[PDB]
Design a protein around this ligand. Structure first.
Ligand SMILES: CCCCCCCC/C=C\CCCCCCCC(=O)OC[C@H](CO)OC(=O)CCCCCCCCCCCCCCC
Ligand SMILES: CCCCCCCC/C=C\CCCCCCCC(=O)OC[C@H](CO)OC(=O)CCCCCCCCCCCCCCC
Ligand SMILES: CC(C)CCC[C@@H](C)[C@H]1CC[C@H]2[C@@H]3CC=C4C[C@@H](OC(=O)CCC(=O)O)CC[C@]4(C)[C@H]3CC[C@]12C
Ligand SMILES: [Ca+2]
Lengths: 686, 150, 148, 142, 49, 50
């Protein structure tokens, strides 16, 4: 049939008279509006405070069209002005300030939106200033996890309202313009707020994207202010300011604390840092690549010399040379490389001792390595002590350092437990499975791998290798997630296969060449025990587990087929499905990281460089044994900030004007302007 | 301008007797083309790349670039939906056939492949659009069951 | 780019090579002792794979292609602990090299191929011109008759 | 009368003026980029340079080199370089007759008829210019 | 509680007359601008600049 | 969902971990209490979704 259509939720309609009044306000016909306004005062025929279907009254229509004249006319007469201030602020029409001047229920704005909050949400330096000039304040957001507040604890009343109110407050406090106009140190304020917003994003799972966006807004603001620096004198004043010694790039340090990567990777910031890093090497940049190569080599080769010099006569020019950051890096990297070289020598017959003597005495190479190991550990100690456990814990690599150092420590200890307690000598074959020496050898070998893999850390220094390391690091996290999924799959099938074959386990003696397992020439008992089942399934991923391992001597075909099916399904799920999927995941990630690789790289390099800028440095083996000032500093900082803000605000306005298209509302305003002008002229000429 | 085109009539440069039309077609303006085509016009036929008589050899000797641009311009005109609509009895078939030709040329004139290919796609789209304008199924039948062969 | 990736792979190879060699070098055996007087990863029954760094390096390289059998991780004296550490190191190498690095190369190469594709023609044509130009010159005769 | 300061050659330490970098390097760097950003404006090269094409070729190369030396501000220099390269291609694209194309591609700044400019382009890795359709057409005929 | 907001790096403010002068320029009222200028020349009440 | 654990969002990951572990371990106890006397405080606890 024909569905009828009616207005289910009706609302009062506007009288024709009222409808005309509103129409005039939209066309800008001051005369008609004025006449109606005067007539209504007499015949009370039109509710001056009437509202269109969309809920737009006369004042609101005027505000949107930006006809200040009609606005005053309306305001002169008694027009309700509820929430009008808010609509003007949103339309960002300075001039409607007349609303602020003049003094005497559907809103598009939630009840918590105060004039200042909206102004901040719009980011109009001018509108905000006006409001700030008069006494204005923004409620203070109770710290995260402030259940003790009781009020916040009383979120049960309206969780939605509370959450929105909070976002609104932060969305205001995170306005570049308000931070610029009201904060003593705009840069630090953005750093701190960016941090909080990020943390809030985590806590408030919902609204996460919003909080995150706000954080990025703060991070960009700080970078942009820095970009407005025009002289090195300024960059220095800014990067070395201590909120409250100075000249320690204090603010650059805070930036790293709060992970302000964009701020750190800013071209000029990098330039200053480079100067400091390559001190004592004028124009290290323009030097020929080979020239640099040789110079680096030379320095590295003399690392023991330089180290000793400093150890002896720090004052001596030679002693002073080591103190330069780039040098320390060269020397400290050389020391490591030699340590690694010593390791290689340990396994090449250099001082190879009888392989039949248990508890052997430390070889010459081993003795040489000892010093380095002790040092590395001592260095880590200094790292933890100075930085703090949390800080040391922060760096992932230090973890690696920890493991490597511990393994080496353990190797040393086992060597002792073997030197003592095993003065005799026996054929290695006779040695038991857990002979201290055998365990020690294994641990040393494991450490040797970690030590060498640590060299990857140095990649950050290079402009070619560094960027890649970062990308790899990101992709590694994805791999980790995938590993969790694979582990469940692996265990699932492991249980099943063990459950199916554990009945047919056989003795090693029965097996050929008394070998039982998957690591024999003839793989056997692959699924007999859970541990072996896990190993077997792992190696199957690499194709190193043969298929005959899925058969039973008794030849129970049904069981065998089921067993092969399980193994087959495992292979398909792991290699064909899961694997190819990891590739897809890694790919996606790569593209994403690729765009911000540089900033991810430079931030890392800066941290590395900053590490040597320190006072105390010495290669691992050769460690051996007025308030007025602050006021002045702050004054200079504030002066620079004043200039940087002015420059910034202006730039932003320019960008908006030149990079923002004309919207429909603009068309409407233009049309009203022509219309209003027409009416005026026609009246005068008529 | 249209108004201006009107006034002028009322009272690069690959040619001049037909350049007005060639440009209009490129301007894909139905109105202007309608005006110009009022007076009989006859675009020159772009001789195939195969010719070797002075017809083309001479030109391809004096100015290969101009010759090539000239032909592209003629086709850019012939492949204008407006012109096909105004001058072709069966607009769809023309679009089909011209699209084929503009493709062949892409292969031959490897240098301007992208240009000749765009024109081909333009023709293809035009025909799709003209079909999209069908409203009833009687129309669809007439269109999809029509032949240009006796 | 592939070259850059190779440098990382090499470093990993060296690391695991040093480690493996460090553990199995105590158990090297003579070629004569070995069946058919054959010693290495290229004998019917692979043997002494991690005995020497040179051999360890070869073994790890071939492992990338699955041509290195797993029985090579066991010592004749059968010291269980050592063998397990050895197999675990070999396994970790396989995972880092095949599952991780290799796959990452795919991602990287996909990223570049995408970009390169954007400017493929200009690159090719610039190259082709250079070639065409070389012949456009006058000093040219085929190599056999190039020399008088 | 108007003049744009000539930027000192890449790595011109000899001039103590370049040793001003010691003071306010930031300014030094910005000032230099500003100069190049100007010298690399298609319109200025058009109005001032005697041989707009060759000027662009050369400037685009110097800018590339600078991109390397000035690690920071690399992106800017690279962008300016591409601007120059595209400018040259665009001028070539405005050729309408073979006579012109031949006059341009065979011009030797100072034999002729040796596609001198094309060779210079290949030297400065001006790929877009060398790949322009009309240019490729001529080469094919040869 | 409440965070008071103030202008930290304050700057001189425009007098009412000066504000009007600049406002006219933004509206393009030549007449008012002209008049303001002339008056300033006489009563020196507005800093043209 | 998280009724019975207000602030669970604020709870430190470790704290959370601890709470979850305990409950899981005592699962048999909670399971029984309900059966015996849903009204019992313990009986009430298992009823919470999380
Ligand atoms: C994430 C985890 C969820 C993924 C879930 C499911 C993924 C689909 C699982 C399908 C596995 C079936 C295969 C089991 C099996 O065939 O055992 C062999 C066993 C070995 O005896 O053989 C058989 O049982 C019967 C012989 C038929 C074999 C052909 C079956 C082909 C099925 C598709 C294979 C896909 C290979 C694609 C490679 C490009
Ligand atoms: C770039 C370089 C940095 C990358 C860093 C780290 C990457 C993660 C490294 C994890 C390697 C652990 C595996 C070592 C190992 O299991 O030895 C086997 C050895 C062989 O005896 O077996 C065992 O030690 C115990 C048996 C458990 C085997 C299951 C372990 C599964 C772990 C994940 C495997 C992922 C395979 C995914 C394929 C789709
Ligand atoms: C590939 C195989 C043979 C392993 C080689 C091991 C080492 C000889 C390599 C591996 C990583 C290399 C390092 C990677 C990073 C750098 C940064 C590099 O500095 C730069 O690239 C830019 C200039 C600067 O450091 O400021 C100095 C050399 C160094 C220490 C490299 C020195 C040589 C290293 C230690
Ligand atoms: Ca450390």
């Amino acid at each position: 049939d024909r569905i009828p259509l009616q207005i289910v939720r009706a609302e009062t309609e506007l009288s024709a008279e009222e409808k005309a009044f509103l129409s005039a306000v939209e066309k800008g016909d001051y005369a008609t509006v004025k006449q109606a306004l005067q007539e209504a005062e007499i015949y009370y025929n039109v509710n001056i405070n009437c509202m269109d279907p969309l809920g737009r009254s006369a004042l609101l229509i005027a505000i949107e069209n930006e006809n200040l004249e009609i606005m005053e006319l309306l305001l002169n007469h008694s027009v309700y002005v509820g929430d009008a201030l808010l609509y003007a602020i949103r339309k960002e029409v300075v001039g409607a300030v007349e609303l602020l001047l003049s003094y005497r229920q559907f809103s598009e704005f939630t009840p918590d939106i105060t004039p200042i909050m909206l102004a901040a949400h719009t980011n109009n330096y001018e509108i905000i200033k006006l409001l700030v000039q008069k006494r204005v304040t923004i409620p203070r957001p109770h710290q995260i996890r402030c259940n003790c507040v009781e009020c916040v604890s009383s979120s049960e009343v309206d969780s939605l309202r509370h959450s929105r109110s909070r976002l609104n407050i932060y969305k205001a406090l995170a306005s570049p313009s308000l931070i610029a106009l009201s904060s003593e140190d705009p840069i630090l304020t953005a750093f701190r707020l960016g941090w909080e917003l990020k943390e809030l994003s985590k806590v408030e799972n919902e609204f996460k994207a919003e909080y995150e966006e706000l954080s990025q807004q703060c991070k960009l603001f700080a970078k942009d202010l820095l970009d407005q620096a025009r002289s090195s004198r300024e960059l220095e004043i800014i990067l070395n300011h201590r909120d409250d010694k100075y000249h320690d790039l204090a603010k650059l340090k805070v930036a790293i604390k709060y992970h302000q990567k964009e701020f750190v990777a800013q071209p000029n910031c990098q330039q200053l840092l480079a100067t400091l890093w390559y001190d004592g090497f004028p124009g290290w940049r323009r030097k020929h690549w080979v020239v640099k190569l040789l110079t680096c080599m030379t320095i590295g080769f003399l690392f023991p010399m330089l180290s000793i010099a400093y150890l002896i006569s720090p004052r001596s020019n030679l002693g002073l040379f080591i103190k330069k950051p780039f040098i320390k890096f060269i020397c400290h990297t050389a020391s490591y490389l030699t340590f690694l070289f010593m390791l290689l020598l340990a396994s090449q017959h250099i001082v190879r001792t009888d392989l039949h003597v248990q508890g052997p005495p430390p070889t010459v190479v081993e003795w040489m390595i000892l010093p380095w190991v002790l040092g590395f550990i001592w260095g880590e100690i200094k790292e933890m002590w100075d930085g703090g456990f949390t800080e040391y814990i922060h760096d992932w690599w230090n973890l690696m350092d920890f493991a490597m150092n511990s393994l080496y420590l353990a190797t040393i200890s086992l060597k002792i437990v073997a030197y003592v307690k095993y003065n005799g000598s026996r054929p290695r074959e006779e040695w038991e499975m857990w002979h201290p020496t055998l365990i020690a050898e294994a641990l040393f070998a494991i450490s040797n791998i970690l030590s060498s893999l640590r060299l990857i850390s140095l990649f950050t220094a290079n402009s070619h290798l560094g960027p890649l390391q970062i990308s790899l690091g990101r992709m590694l996290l994805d791999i980790l997630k995938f590993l969790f999924i694979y582990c469940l799959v692996l265990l699932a099938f492991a249980n099943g296969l063990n459950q199916l074959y554990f009945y047919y386990e056989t003795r090693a003696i029965d097996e050929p060449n008394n070998c039982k397992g998957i690591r024999c020439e003839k793989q056997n008992n692959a699924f007999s025990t859970l541990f072996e089942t896990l190993q077997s399934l792992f190696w199957s991923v690499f194709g190193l587990l043969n298929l005959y391992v899925t058969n039973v001597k008794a030849r129970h075909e049904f069981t065998e087929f089921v067993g092969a099916t399980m193994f087959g399904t495992y292979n398909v799920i792991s290699l064909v499905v899961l694997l190819n999927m990891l590739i897809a995941m890694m790919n996606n990630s790569y593209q994403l990281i690729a765009d911000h690789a540089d900033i991810e790289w430079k931030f890392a390099r800066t941290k590395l460089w900053m590490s040597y800028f320190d006072e105390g440095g010495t290669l691992p083996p050769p460690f051996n044994i007025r308030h007025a000032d602050s006021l002045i500093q702050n004054q200079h900082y504030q002066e620079v900030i004043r200039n940087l803000v002015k420059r910034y605000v202006a730039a932003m306005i320019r960008n908006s004007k030149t990079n923002e298209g004309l919207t429909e509302e603009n068309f409407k305003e233009l049309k009203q302007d022509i219309s209003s002008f027409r009416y005026e002229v026609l009246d005068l000429l008529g | 301008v249209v108004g201006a085109v009107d006034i002028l009539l009322n009272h690069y440069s690959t040619t001049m007797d037909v350049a007005p039309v060639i440009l209009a077609a490129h301007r894909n303006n139905y109105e202007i083309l309608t005006m110009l085509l009022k007076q009989d016009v006859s675009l020159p036929k772009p001789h195939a790349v195969g010719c070797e008589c002075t017809l083309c050899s001479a030109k391809n000797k004096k100015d290969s670039l101009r010759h090539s641009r000239f032909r592209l311009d003629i086709y850019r005109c012939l492949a204008s939906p407006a012109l096909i609509m105004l001058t072709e009895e069966d607009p769809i078939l023309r679009a089909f056939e011209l699209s084929a030709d503009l493709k062949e040329l892409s292969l031959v004139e490897v240098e301007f492949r992208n240009d000749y290919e765009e024109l081909a796609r333009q023709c293809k789209m035009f025909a799709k659009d003209l079909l999209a304008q069908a409203r009833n199924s009687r129309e669809l039948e007439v269109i999809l069951n029509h032949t240009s062969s006796d």
